[PDB]
Write a protein that binds this ligand. Structure first.
Ligand SMILES: NC(=O)C[C@@H]1NC(=O)C2(CCCCC2)NC(=O)C[C@@H](c2ccc(CC(=O)O)cc2)/C=C/C[C@@H](Cc2cccc3ccccc23)CNC1=O
Ligand SMILES: NC(=O)C[C@@H]1NC(=O)C2(CCCCC2)NC(=O)C[C@@H](c2ccc(CC(=O)O)cc2)/C=C/C[C@@H](Cc2cccc3ccccc23)CNC1=O
Ligand SMILES: NC(=O)C[C@@H]1NC(=O)C2(CCCCC2)NC(=O)C[C@@H](c2ccc(CC(=O)O)cc2)/C=C\C[C@@H](Cc2cccc3ccccc23)CNC1=O
Lengths: 90, 95, 94
């Protein structure tokens, strides 16, 4: 369904996710403190892992190395490439 | 150039604006309320015009039609394309 | 509400230094590294600068105590001094 939840509190995001049935359900939340600081929360097993969406000096987004111009591109790329140094897909 | 943030009491923020030498001078206001919406406060003459920063389901930012991947990109774009659909206003930094 | 804009360092510090209360502050965001922050804090006629440090878990801190967000760090230092020798508490500009 939707994956962007705006400035939803970390704890509420984890409550949402933690209840999901499937390994790979995710959301992106935006920091209330830092405009355009995004986090990706992903359910896996009994935990919910959290990845900061990094920005480079041109404002591109990335998790580790590869850069994306938009959150949508990052999400779609990580539908087939793992977000973790562990096998984590959507 | 760097961005500076601070909790100006809104009235003082508006006083600071419009006293700038350029109409295009602007600030970004961050909503106190739950969504945390963003707005642009832009000087024009002695008044301050307000532009809502709208968001879609992919997290993009926009004012009218064209969408932007960051607030920074929106600002930089409107340094060269007018922010208003009537009067020609171009965003400028605080002087 | 929070207002941010592109104020030149020198003008920002001039405005700050002119504030009536020690501890009045602004947050500066890096030009090079989006979301890299420092705190500019009035103390007398000076402006002290505290880098917002980040660790390997993404926590925010200035000295020893670590916080989960920039907001938590700032609010904590509204009631606990940012300086060890000087009693300096963050407050909004007026
Ligand atoms: N992005 C825009 O604002 C463009 C456009 N501009 C305006 O209306 C003018 C003023 C400046 C000159 C140009 C017209 N803005 C306004 O009068 C007020 C402006 C404003 C500014 C700040 C704040 C404070 C804050 O939210 O924190 C609130 C509201 C209102 C914007 C609402 C918008 C109607 C609307 C509402 C909800 C969802 C929408 C989705 C898609 C389209 C429109 C939607 C009408 N408004 C324009 O569509
Ligand atoms: N969080 C802290 O700052 C704690 C401590 N700060 C200080 O002692 C005081 C300030 C109060 C009075 C004098 C001492 N800080 C400073 O003088 C400089 C203060 C500053 C802040 C912002 C501006 C403006 C701007 O960059 O745009 C300029 C300078 C930060 C200094 C950096 C810090 C060391 C550091 C940090 C991050 C990564 C590092 C990687 C490798 C090595 C060192 C690293 C040293 N400094 C303190 O760790
Ligand atoms: N993009 C990435 O996160 C890659 C990588 N992430 C991780 O290793 C794992 C999560 C999965 C299981 C354990 C490892 N995340 C973390 O440790 C912390 C994780 C996180 C996510 C969301 C929340 C808040 C919430 O909950 O909203 C808090 C923390 C992200 C990042 C912190 C990062 C260090 C760092 C800090 C600042 C600037 C940096 C610039 C360049 C490189 C690193 C920087 C270390 N961490 C990873 O660089």
């Amino acid at each position: 369904g939707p994956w962007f939840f705006g400035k939803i509190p970390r704890a509420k995001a984890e409550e949402m996710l933690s209840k999901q049935r499937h390994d790979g359900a995710f959301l992106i939340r935006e920091s209330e403190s830092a405009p355009g600081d995004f986090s990706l929360s992903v359910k896996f097993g009994n935990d919910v892992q959290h990845f900061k969406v990094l920005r480079d000096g041109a404002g591109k987004y990335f998790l580790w190395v590869v850069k994306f111009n938009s959150l949508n591109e990052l999400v779609d790329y990580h539908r087939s490439t793992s977000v973790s140094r562990n096998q984590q897909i959507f």
